[PDB]
Amino acid sequence: MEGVYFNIDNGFIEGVVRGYRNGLLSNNQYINLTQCDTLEDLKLQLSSTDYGNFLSSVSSESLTTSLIQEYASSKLYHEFNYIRDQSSGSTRKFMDYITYGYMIDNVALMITGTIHDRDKGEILQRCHPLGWFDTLPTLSVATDLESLYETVLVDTPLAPYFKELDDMNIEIIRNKLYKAYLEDFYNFVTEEIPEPAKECMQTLLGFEADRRSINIALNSLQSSDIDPDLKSDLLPNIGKLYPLATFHLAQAQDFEGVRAALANVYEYRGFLETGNLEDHFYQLEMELCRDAFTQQFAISTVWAWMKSKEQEVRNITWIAECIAQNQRERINNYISVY
Template sequence: MEALSFNIEAGYLEGIVRGYRATMLTQTNYQSLTQCETLEDFRMQMSATDYGNFLANEPSPLATSAVSQQATRKLVAEFEYLRTNATEPLSRFLDYLTYSYMIDNVVLLITGTLHGRDTQELLERCHPLGWFDTLPALSVATNVEELYRTVLVDTPLAPYFRDCFSAADLDDLNIEVIRNKLYKAYLEDFYEFARSLGGSTAENMTKLLAFEADRRTINITINSFGTSLSKEERGRLYPTIGHLYPAGNNALARADAIDQVRSIIEWVPEYKRLFDDGSGISSEGVDFNALEDRMFAYEVELNRLLSMNQFQYSIFYSWLKLKEQEIRSITWIAECIAQDARDRINDFVPPV
């Protein structure tokens, strides 16, 4: 029944997003990009892909920041086409995809303001998918209550602020606590909404959101070592979903050292690959880049696998995540070319 009725409301947009997915860069494209000697060569190689002449109006010498900005602009245009043409419940599902960008924009702006950064510069760095009308007013907020009352009360993020008012003063630690509380509430809410959709969408999205929740739990644990955040406060920041919940979350909340984190995470068979050769986490310390790259690689694999099924909404989530990874990859290659760091140019995670 699901397959019979799906195309009535969402079949056209599923076809569009699968078309977007099919035009992503291939292994051959990445190989050609890594062989470029200059950013002008890079610009020419990119023009032969689906990105076309997206860099044609950028002045020489080409800035790597322009690569990321213009690629993001293309992504946003494609996403907004999907959202403009969507109807319920797909339109609401696509709205949920933007909430994480809203959270990141809020945290970026209040952190930058706290450190005296120029407001206009901060607004230019905000992700377009997370923009809302009252975002510029964030720079005047001095505490969480004022932030909520004057800026966020009429945004989709308002319900997620219920547990944030205990962190009244805006300092670096409290801002990170607020970020993690917002993500916790957001992921739990999105998870319940995905489950309510039923069918393949619910099955696939609960897997994808479970991984995202576990990744945040792992990062919170590692980043809390050496800070004034108590174990009780740390545990309250963990999302109550995911493969690690509840036993793994409870154990991580009590962890005191890196080796304990590794042993707990390895309870989940899917996560053993993160530490198979010990380069991600060791008793001597943490290589955050190695661990993050492995998480990205697992996320790419998961999104590729779960986007193969038809007649379900998770293809929209997976396409967005894979496209984000593609933008990170091409920006990394461009940066390595600009810095003449040829020995590191292949240190990216291709989303294909």
């Protein structure tokens, strides 16, 4: 049974992460924030939640929505790093993998800044704390393929995923990196994570890979140079769409074909039919995470917490935008399942 051996290594971690989950803003707290009508009032109201005084260093006048988002995300990352510190063995590998996605994001950001004529010194101020690694500034030697895996990326944990350098090439490299990383992490979950967490993380990673696959399939229609072979190379092999719907998406070269491919899958049909697609993807993610919190002795609770807290940071930011911009007529467009 899961709880028989889970609490040997992950008892404290799971308890603390469950406390963090208890700290997620409930719909009532989101409504109270929504009632706020200025950024300083939002800061006061947000001090009453588990966010506490995270904005104590910011004066009421210096407060801005970017600072709110940055500070909430810094709190989230400090909490995640704390949970990672207490982690060991398979749990530590699980959290390292969680950070691998942000490492890939940081690689892409650094190379995009490099082609964009921004020095690495200033770009490191933008890199996520989770994705930091030693050779991060050394990877972006130049705007050529000799960078990354050729010189420095071999020392990074992303090295196995690398098996010109224009903006389009940058995005293709990033999407290939996510594809390989998601496949590798699905494999690690299947081979090394206990059964409840195994299935929960398998479902969550299937949804993540499907979100990607769908987004790439839809966006590559916009006069992109990615041929269907490259698209097939960009779609992960782990999603709920794999292999039938993934193949249909890869070959489809029109919106109607993509919609037909999605209609094949029960879990996603209806997402592309109506409403904003990203809203549907976020709602599905939140429902999956809320389900993931019903399982007690599962390390998926960590992932479910991260993607939950991350969503929270968006919501608190979106409200902070609508309050800042006086766009109150859409202040309720956030997703909150708690």
